[PDB]
């Protein structure tokens, strides 16, 4: 209540405070507790193999230099005080581009406690790398992590833990990605060794399951409809050369445009995906339908009836095998 | 352990310290050791002729002004101390855009040693130029370098070396580019002379080998399939003018769309690439197939049978010569 008294207390705390030295410098490591509140996952990019996360990132530690007596309150201080305090040198090892939000002020909090516990909160948006295995795309499940580490302090000097264990990360239910469901999240803690020493690591990972629905509609269904269209040829008279050759060409060429378009939406991976296998199967069907007419055409100068049954039935077999293997 | 003692020692080190003067100013050059830990190569752009690298960049040197006694520890200091110290004026001569990561703090380390050795680490993402020879594209091998130099200090004042020789750069095995394999990396050291004097240079280069698989699927296979499609014409009766002319047109025009699309994905180079040579060969085949019908059409008002053998066989020869020359 007495602001001169509080001002005096805080001034005394910061008098001769050396930001260069961690708490308990030269002694046992400072234990830093971390908890995350997820705000959003804005984007997941296959082409860039990354995702964009917004979170409230909070760090908990004790700095005995900041302990104060005679005030039974927790002091919430203006965020600019953070520039006069030691804070951990935490970074995101797999981040590509990150920033602290700055409107209307730097989205930063400092709360002091009488025992010298410092609560430091930041609102961060990060684009973080996530190598994806697209062999089963778009029936794939991905593991995207966020790796949290101390930049310069080894485990001799700093230690990390998930504050609250399995409850340290909240808001996973808020994530609303149209193309993915969050199946699971996990929290891991370990030490990572480099040439410069052993460093504390915390890892947050999510399991993302792609929703098929968009792909059924966008790629699978057009390919099915083109393949069915190709079969119309078999019910046309063999003398209708222009009509039946037109059907063959248009379906074959449409399947090429669909294939090439699709792979321009994705990174230039050297392996065959699940969707590639489907499109290649559909291409073979429609190409053989045109070749069937060439064969009919070739001899006329029963085969159509046999084509009318064998082609739809074989396509059913193809689909059965495909969707069983991958679903 | 005694933080007042450590604070006193460090304050004494920085008392009267002149950041303007290099260590041993006016004396022999300061030897700066450099080691790199590669985190990622995010992107390689043919259109922009550049690549994006993330690395941990560390500099080693001795500053006798910072030597301290009576403390048998290496002091890890808050990264903000870097602003009160001399550091080398290292830059990347072929970089296009670079930044030091800033979340949650500037990704920077300072470690002092009792003898006055300073360890200075930065986490940097750089987009760096890489002129590519695309004459054999996409069967090409590229050499992309990173050129490290002192901006303002000559070899009279500063010297660079790879700390650890051939082990100074780690993490090359981590690089996972879908479209490239890292064949080799090399470390070079030399002096570079400009009008303003001789400057120390370190060069890190990689040899990148393009993976063919994507290109086989995306461009080579469609072109093969269009060329085969063109041959169907030769099995159609010569009276089927609409059918056979349709085949000629559609294949010719499809090969033009494939060509023009492809070169819109690449820089506006004035020379012919390997892929251009293939597409031009395929164009000639399908164009001649249509011209073959014009010739048949021209006289009807044996040639088809001779076309049925000579065209596929010639395409096989064309492919044999091509893939031998380039693979």
């Amino acid at each position: 209540g007495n602001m001169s008294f509080v001002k005096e207390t805080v001034d005394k705390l910061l008098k001769g405070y050396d930001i260069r030295l961690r708490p308990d410098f030269g002694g046992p490591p400072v234990c830093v507790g971390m908890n995350i509140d997820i705000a959003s996952i804005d984007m997941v990019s296959e082409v860039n193999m990354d995702y964009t996360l917004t979170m409230y990132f909070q760090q908990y530690w004790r700095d005995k230099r900041l302990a104060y007596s005679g005030i039974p309150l927790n002091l919430t201080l203006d965020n600019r005080v953070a520039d006069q305090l030691w804070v951990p040198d935490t970074y995101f090892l797999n981040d590509k581009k990150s920033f602290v939000h700055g409107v209307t002020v730097k989205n930063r909090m400092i709360r002091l406690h009488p025992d010298g516990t410092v609560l430091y909160g930041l609102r961060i948006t990060t684009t973080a790398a996530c190598m994806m295995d697209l062999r089963r795309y778009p029936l794939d499940e991905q593991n995207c992590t966020l790796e949290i580490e101390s930049y310069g302090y080894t485990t001799d000097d700093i230690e990390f833990y998930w504050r609250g264990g399995d409850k340290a990360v909240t808001g996973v239910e808020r994530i609303e990605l149209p193309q993915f469901s969050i199946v699971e999240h996990r929290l891991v803690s370990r030490n990572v060794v480099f040439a410069t020493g052993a460093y504390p690591r915390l890892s947050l990972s999510f399991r993302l399951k792609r929703n098929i629905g968009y792909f059924i509609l966008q790629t699978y269904m057009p390919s099915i409809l083109i393949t069915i269209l190709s079969w119309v040829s078999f019910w046309i008279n063999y003398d209708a050369s222009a009509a039946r050759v037109a059907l063959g060409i248009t379906t074959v060429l449409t399947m090429t445009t669909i294939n090439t378009h699709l792979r321009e939406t994705l990174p230039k991976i050297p392996y065959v995906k699940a969707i590639d296998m489907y499109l290649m199967g559909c291409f073979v069907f429609v190409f053989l339908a045109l070749l069937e007419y060439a064969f009919v055409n070739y001899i006329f100068f029963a085969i159509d009836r046999w084509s009318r049954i064998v082609f739809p039935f074989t396509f059913s077999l193809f689909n059965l095998v495909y969707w069983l293997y991958y679903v | 352990g005694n933080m007042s003692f450590v604070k006193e020692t460090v304050d004494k080190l920085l008392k009267g310290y002149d950041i303007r003067l290099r260590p041993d100013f006016g004396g022999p050059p300061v030897c700066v050791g450099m080691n790199i830990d590669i985190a990622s190569i995010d992107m390689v752009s043919e259109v922009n002729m550049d690549y994006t690298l993330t690395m941990y960049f560390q500099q080693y040197w001795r500053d006798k002004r910072l030597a301290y006694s009576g403390i048998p520890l290496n002091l890890t200091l808050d990264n903000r101390v870097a602003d009160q110290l001399w550091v080398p004026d290292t830059y990347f001569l072929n970089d296009k855009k670079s930044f030091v990561h800033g979340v949650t703090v500037k990704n920077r380390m300072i470690r002092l040693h009792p003898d006055g050795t300073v360890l200075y680490g930065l986490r940097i993402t750089t987009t760096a130029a890489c002129m590519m020879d695309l004459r054999r594209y996409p069967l090409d091998e590229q050499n992309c370098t990173l050129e490290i130099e002192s901006y303002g200090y000559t070899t009279d004042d500063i010297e660079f070396y790879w700390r650890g020789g051939d082990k100074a750069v780690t993490g090359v095995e981590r690089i996972e580019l879908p479209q490239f394999s890292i064949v080799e990396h090399r470390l070079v050291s030399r002096n570079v002379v400009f009008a303003t004097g001789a400057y120390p240079r370190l060069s890190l280069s990689f040899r990148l080998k393009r993976n063919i698989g994507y290109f086989i699927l995306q461009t080579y296979m469609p072109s093969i399939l269009i060329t085969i499609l063109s041959w169907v014409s030769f099995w159609i009766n010569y009276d089927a003018s609409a059918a056979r002319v349709a085949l000629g047109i559609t294949t010719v025009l499809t090969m033009t769309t494939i060509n023009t699309h492809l070169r819109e994905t690449l820089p506006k180079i004035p020379y012919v690439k390997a892929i251009d040579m293939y597409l031009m060969g395929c164009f000639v085949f399908v164009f001649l197939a249509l011209l073959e019908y014009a010739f048949v059409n021209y006289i009807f008002f044996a040639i088809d049978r001779w076309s049925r053998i000579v065209f596929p066989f010639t395409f096989s020869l064309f492919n044999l010569v091509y893939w031998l020359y380039y693979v």
Partner: nanobody
Framework: QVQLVESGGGLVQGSLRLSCAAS????????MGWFRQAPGKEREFVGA????????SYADSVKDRFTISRDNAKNTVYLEMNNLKPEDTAVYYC??????????????????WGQGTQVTV
């Protein structure tokens, strides 16, 4: 979750080919390492290979003697131990490293350890 079974050790006086067959989620663990533990001594780095690309690295002791490579079809890595020496007498272990799990050289960075073939010469 990776399982590693190694075979082809044994006792010889000579060229040898240790093999290391992986199965499971190998995508999350792109690097395979070879270690060896002599009796008494600490567990020691031999070499490592990336599954994708085959980017290889060796300890000095075995540089230009041993050669590692792999085949992704079988999910198999092999240490081709040529030009053997009586220093090369240890339980050779295979291990998998996570993508972000640190330096190649440090066995504590590795999670999934093979059984370990004893090799004496």
């Amino acid at each position: 979750q990776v399982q590693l079974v190694e075979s082809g050790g044994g006792l010889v006086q000579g060229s040898l080919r240790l093999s290391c067959a992986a199965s499971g989620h190998t995508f999350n663990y792109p690097i395979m390492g070879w270690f060896r533990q002599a009796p008494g001594k600490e567990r020691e780095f031999v070499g490592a290979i990336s599954w994708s690309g085959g980017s290889t690295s060796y300890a000095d002791s075995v540089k230009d003697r041993f050669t590692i490579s792999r085949d992704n079809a079988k999910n198999t890595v092999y240490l081709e131990m040529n030009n053997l020496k009586p220093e090369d007498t240890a339980v050779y272990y295979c291990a998998a490293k996570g993508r972000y799990s640190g330096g190649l050289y440090y066995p504590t960075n590795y999670d999934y350890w093979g059984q370990g073939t004893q090799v004496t010469v």
